[PDB]
């Protein structure tokens, strides 16, 4: 029931549309207005769209929601462009836990990570195909030998 609800699979279609049933399933009833995703839809691009909305609808009051959601959008865009680097899914999961209930000032972000955590839970393979490049945030400064962390 909404863009801020956790995705469920075909197995959860036999669950009654009640607040307790969907909650135990691992999501929320929300507005009870469900949306169906077909096999021709990529989960990474779908969640990227969801995050782009949740990220720009932020009011900018608390850091977790104001600076954390924009990070996820960039990771998801990199994954859908095949430019993902190792550690991206872990950051996404850490964001989902640290933008959860209680951490943010209101429930915009707690509900914004609900679709993301679910997509990684049931369709991780789609998020993994994105990581195709080695991790690198540093260029090579000439004259300075780099600290080779192993």
């Amino acid at each position: 029931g909404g863009a801020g609800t956790d995705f469920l699979t075909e197995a959860h279609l036999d669950l009654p549309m009640e607040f307790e049933s969907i909650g135990k399933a691992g999501s929320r009833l929300g507005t009870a207005l469900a949306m169906a995703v077909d096999h021709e839809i990529n989960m990474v691009s779908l969640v990227r769209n969801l995050e782009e909305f949740f990220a720009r609808e932020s009011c900018g009051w608390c850091t977790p929601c104001r600076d954390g959601l924009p990070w996820s959008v960039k990771i998801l865009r990199a994954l859908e462009r095949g430019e993902g680097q190792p550690g991206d899914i872990e950051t996404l999961e850490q964001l989902c836990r640290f933008l959860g209930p209680g951490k943010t000032f209101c429930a915009h972000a707690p509900g914004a990570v609900e679709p993301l955590q679910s997509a990684i839970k049931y369709f991780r393979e789609e998020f993994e195909a994105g990581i195709k490049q080695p991790f690198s945030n540093t260029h090579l400064i000439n004259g300075i030998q780099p600290n080779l962390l192993k």
């Binding site: 000439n142 004259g143 300075i144 030998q145």
Partner: protein, 200 residues
């Protein structure tokens, strides 16, 4: 070339003067030849007395690769920290030397106290002993002392000390030489690229 007259240490006669020899009243070609001969013998016969202090003495012995008496020495190299308990000793040894005498300060400590601005250290030997050449470094490379000796030779070849203690002016005229820093400013500033600190 201007000269500094030390007629007859922290406070003493230091009048800036003109080449006493060039002055016509005391201008004699023979006297000039005599001055040059004495300066030549002194600059080419600088016997040293290395007062070993702290770690600089170790670099000095590497350069060495002896006037054990201050009496036979013409140069006292202060190489080390001027500790409070050592300062009286340094002054006594320098005061047991005969004219002409020179002093080269080797090391940041002997130069100004260096990294040891502490209660037990004199901030520079130039606080009690007149110095002629200062060698920056900690410790200064053995080759740096050799450069200092060559700089002293040049300064000694331009001095106008009394030719005899019974006649003439008994004044030590030391030339106001050009600072080495300004002399080699051009080449230093021209430097553009250097080897990356990545290779041996």
């Amino acid at each position: 070339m201007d000269y500094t007259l030390t007629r007859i240490y922290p406070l003493q006669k230091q009048e800036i003067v003109t080449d006493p020899l060039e002055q016509e009243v005391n201008k004699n070609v023979f006297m000039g030849k005599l001055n040059d001969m004495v300066n030549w013998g002194r600059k080419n016969s600088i016997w040293p007395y290395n007062f070993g202090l702290s770690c600089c003495y170790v670099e000095m012995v590497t350069s060495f690769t002896l006037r054990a008496s201050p009496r036979q020495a013409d140069l006292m190299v202060v190489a080390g920290t001027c500790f409070t308990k050592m300062a009286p000793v340094i002054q006594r040894l320098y005061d047991q030397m005969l004219e002409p005498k020179w002093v080269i300060s080797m090391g940041a400590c002997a130069n100004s106290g260096g990294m040891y601005d502490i209660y037990s250290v004199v901030q520079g030997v130039d606080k009690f002993i007149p110095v002629d050449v200062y060698i920056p470094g900690c410790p200064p490379r053995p080759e740096a002392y050799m450069q200092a000796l060559m700089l002293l030779q040049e300064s000694i070849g331009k001095e106008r000390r009394p030719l005899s203690w019974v006649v003439g002016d008994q004044g030590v005229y030391r030339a106001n030489m050009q600072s080495e820093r300004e002399r080699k400013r051009g080449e230093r500033i021209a430097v553009t690229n250097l080897r990356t600190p990545d290779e041996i």
